[model samples]
Target: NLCPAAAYDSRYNTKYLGFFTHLVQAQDDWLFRTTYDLRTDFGTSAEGWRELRALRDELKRKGIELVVVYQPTRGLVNREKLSPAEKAGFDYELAKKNYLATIARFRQAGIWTPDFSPLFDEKEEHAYYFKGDHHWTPHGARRSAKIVAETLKQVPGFEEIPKKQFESKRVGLLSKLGTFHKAAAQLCGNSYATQYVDRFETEPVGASGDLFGDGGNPQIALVGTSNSGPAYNFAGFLEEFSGADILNNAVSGGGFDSSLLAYMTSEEFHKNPPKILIWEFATHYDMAQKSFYRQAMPLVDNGCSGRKTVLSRKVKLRQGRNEVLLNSAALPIRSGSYVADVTYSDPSVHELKNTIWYMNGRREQLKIEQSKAVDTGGRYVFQLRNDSDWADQQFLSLEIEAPDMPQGLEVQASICQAA
Candidate 1:
């Protein structure tokens, strides 16, 4: 019904997503398993907590701390929005349990985070969420913003910063109907009632209020899905919370991976490392999606040699005993057997951890051939036996750890593969 045979105009804000909205309401079983069933035959990629840890570990090298801001889904926070039957059938308790469980799991897994579910539910009737849409209403945005600000301000380094002020320039717009309403429109029409949210204009007028003010370098950065952006008043709240200028890089529609990866690879982060990177993500933001990682942090080769120093920003690597480089190159996992040749500048001076890591999106390290010695590098090959277990079979990169912080000596390295 969504993609009809006749004229369907999305340019007029008319694409059918209402089906999925109704699906959440009616198909309780499907929604439960898809979102959080816990049991998974799918390996690391499906529920890859390990990858997040790796990302946290990697980001820490750049002096960036990781914090998660867990956002509950519309159904969980605003159950009153659902009909009694829909509410009864749906896994409301499970969903509620999930918020607590995930917050604990993430914290225990070393990613310290705050649960905003309670703040969100403190008064769902307060109009913090859009009635028909999946995103937050401006009221919801303001409420959640306060919570985010509170939690962020307590995070040691951010406590001292003064909150930037913003004048309220109330703007209004008629919100499109829910996804189900839009989908229904293809068959029928917009049966849903008109809904709107009055929001603060994105621009901040006070001192140090601008996102990239005077280009003096951003002090804080908030990353994640749409929940962290202006529509939800996240950036504003972050500024109000931290009392400093913020670099709000959250992008809507795209998953957290895209925004984060871009931020990680961007010149902005490279030049000015923020004190904290608060990742606001929905439960649906699972790291196990293979394609997502492949695109974000692609297992590609690092440009290295005598002259081309194309590695990422020079990380201080302060915490760890030894600092090393990972994700140097990707190997094709295909029918033909492959061979590897490795090279490094000033090979004698720089020392690799004497291990070659080949892994996929799950941060699962692949087993490779053993090396001989540093002066005489060894040939690494992909074993057929290991190949058998390579699920979602695709390119697996050879990751190595080299102490680039060998003072004045920069470690130049590259991994080359041949079939």
Candidate 2:
């Protein structure tokens, strides 16, 4: 084989033990997972903006505003902190400048994006970002929360949010350089990593004197990247700043579209629509790829609460009857339709004659609709009425069954319960 599983090179110490790469520059310490995409124009992908605009337009119709927080990379805000030798190696200034430029194009296209790159630079010296790592320090997170809070209020629908009355008390900050140090720390195992960053914990002292006691629907909802979740204290900082009990549903590494889609289809979103939904996205992966981004947006108007999954694997039938089962999940009570993006082994394989599907409380024949395939890929699409829930709704499975099933077919499929 031309490629080997492992190779050894001492030059890449900044990242010695992972992902089989050996080109660590000095500032490699600052290269968070966000840095991986910088090699090819960060935020250069134009695909995501269209999706954001779609969601923004939909939410606008429902009296809710959508705020996109393109979280700033430390490289931009702290480019001055780079060592003399490192400055030559990294184009931190141009990187940030270009990113802002990229985001500007988004605004030209009508996306409601706010500028946060310079948000923390006023008192930049004390420490908004780790001198060693690529992440924001606790105070940096707390400060970023303040900027987001101020930024959201500018949105029309959320202009009247009540003031927050809360405080944060945290211990000293822990200092670690990179992921390797984090992996074995006291937090990750280095529970110390948690201890390291937890020092930045900005817990909210609720005005009601109870953090979890206030029970009404929150004023805002959050869907974010890895930085959005607990370890980062984004929710905590947000709580301290937004006074209202925020419904924080930020997922770590969950693609923003996936997380956003998951939230839009969630009961919380439907039952208690907040004044605004703050989507915190990692600037690095803004344009990673568009599977869900290209699919139906979580639009109430378009009845787009359905899901879409793309796959590439061969499938088989056990006996005279075996069904092809796609992905499923324990979804809340929702009414949608089931449509699978698929193609069969042969032209003889038909939907009504060959494919059947199932979910929690719904099951029906996969009605084959052939002709112009999605994107000219020659796919036989089948759809069914899907109304399901975990308890008494739809089961999470799409079964493609026929009396005489085919084997070794290219059956990469997607089963979306789109009601």
Candidate 3:
């Protein structure tokens, strides 16, 4: 055990002192959670890299370039605040080595990825991350955007984007109670001061709101977690540095795929696909979810546009679960041969839970959920799994449970053969 369970580290001035279960109190009252970070390895599996390459190639076929902005963990950026023992216990050197190797692998796969290792040595007046929160500060966002923008220019098609001059400025102070602080409070009833940083906003430098007319659309689109949201002004900073307007499709509180899922399912995406798609996410997130890529790849193809439909239905969903597709004897579907595409009349359907039943009595469940911040455009698509025990099961039926909403929603769905 590298990080020993203890009451406190005597080197740092601390207040919430107890057996360190979840939170580690760093120097100057800085707090950290063990579960979220503090990892020994950051390696991606070979299959994961293959999935990434597939996504990149698929996007390329649609004339879109994929740029991945992989964010560094807070522990890597703020290791200076850690006590000597904690710092060594984290194995910073090894972890950083592995992290850089991961970046190299992305480049080897021909994905446009920027190296964020520079953040580890930053000595700016303001810290890169909040003292007690998992999120980054404005200064962090600005620095990261600068790095990403540099890489964005190196992308093959960047020269074609319409340039625009954008400016970012501090608007006010933003404060947060912080998840770490709340957990510490629950542990010992001690309250820490709220974390605060400069709030910022960015806009075009000209009077006519710079660049896009009613018929015009941005050539770049951003998709990611809360860090890319308006509060941090990440997309704005990218615009200021990259000299281009961006469609910020990031979803706050959504893990990794929510925003990307929402954007790909929208009519806007299919009608006017951007030249560049920036996918940003933190290192702590699990990118090896095989199901995510299984569903994502089909949506990138715009979902059943010239495929044979084996089952089709248009029904008003009830408050609970509704059977949208029941395979009749006339149309028996082998689970391995088909994918499901669903669209809702309402754009606010953030989640869709579905049950796929097999003739052998085996059942599998899956859900597509998006953050409230995402404009989902009311669409979902997924391929039936063909691995392991699922390979031999013929489709019995499919039922989707509607999420709670103010008004009733209608669904138009179909089972389509793989194109």
Candidate 4:
């Protein structure tokens, strides 16, 4: 037995093999997965498409063009690293067709999404993705950014934006301990060598050596997962290729919605909205979560500002759950038409839970969590879900659970219509 404990690991052993069936051991000591990174089905829910178009049109009303960089999966970009047998097992042809079709759908929906099918079979010496980890390598990020820049140049109002000559130079080397390595070490005794790649930095030419601050507040905003972060130099490469300074608001460990919500809820976004907002995310995310759009769409207009509040209450919360707001007969609120705007007395509380009671005896529990890496300003706003199941229901009352910290925190909450 390579690892005796692996036999009893019910999480991995599914009444079948004694090893992790999902982890595919490919050639050259490289690894892949079955659930997400190598899946053949490429689809999103109708609600996801509806909300995405809504978000796009809302941004357009504010003179902001929305661009979505739907990053291809690791297997799609690094299939060559796999063995012939392993590669044969994966349905790359169908996956590529569906991926391209989805890109076309997004463009038809009025979103400026660039086609990344060219990266499917790259012939570069440097791999597009780390053999051990799921994220794209610096080289991969640079190549993808070049494609995005090409598409961005043709976007309306691209020429009007100020430009600067930016250059990316190789600086050092980055070593990555692949996620597969950790899984393999626990599941089996196998160990793979660490992956290494070249590091790069981008700077503007002929100005103060400072790559930032001198370029003025960026008109291009980037919000998404860790791939857009400094570690991969994705934003730097975008600056280098597009010649426009990028305001990067990406958060590592923050999934599809966190960084977008954080950026939208902040005062920075309200004061000076970007001319172009680039959203990057992997395909594995649950973009169909109705609660996400409920929160996101309202925040585009800064949430509840200039709108009439149907019901409001301020309460000094106790340790346990506290009923903060109740709609009186005079102030009746329809469930589908309104959103709740909440503010905490203390900003340190980054997480909270709220319950909505409907007039028809149905109650829904919703949890709101913010990443510590983001500056949330202790504020949260979300529209009520208007799906078929919840649309006909009327608002009864709302409750919130107090965080474990700061006793006797005061919460001010109001329900306002999206109009």
Clash totals in order: 8, 24, 0, 0
The candidate maximizing lDDT is 4
Give the better candidate number (2 or 3) by lDDT.
Answer: 3
TM-score of each: 0.60, 0.60, 0.86, 0.90
Q: Rate residue 308 of model 4 by lDDT.
A: 72
lDDT of 3 at 132: 75
lDDT of 1 at 311: 26
Which runs in model 4 stand beyond 4 Å of their true positions? 1-21, 207-217, 306-308, 359-362, 392-394
Let me know the TM-score candidate 1 reaches against the reference structure.
Answer: 0.60
How many residue pairs clash in model 2?
24
TM-score computed on alpha carbons, candidate 2: 0.60
Candidates arranged by lDDT, highest first: 4, 3, 2, 1
TM-score of 3: 0.86
Q: Candidate 4 residues 1-419, lDDT tens each? A: 23454323354754333323367767776777766667787758787777788889988998889999999987788878877987888888888888888888788779999889988966789889887676899999999999999988888877767678899999999889887676778678777778779999998886642234324557889998888878899999999999888889999978798899999998889889988999999888887787788788889988876677878788998888899888658356777877889988888888878999998779989898877777676889987868788866889889998886687688989888777
Q: What value does the lDDT take at residue 235 in candidate 3? A: 94
Per-residue alpha-carbon lDDT of candidate 3 for residues 124-230, written as tens digits (9 for 90 to 100): 78999887777888889999999999999998867767777899989999888876677567655768888778999998876553354323467999999898988
Worst 10 residues of 2 by lDDT: 1-10
Clashes of 1: 8
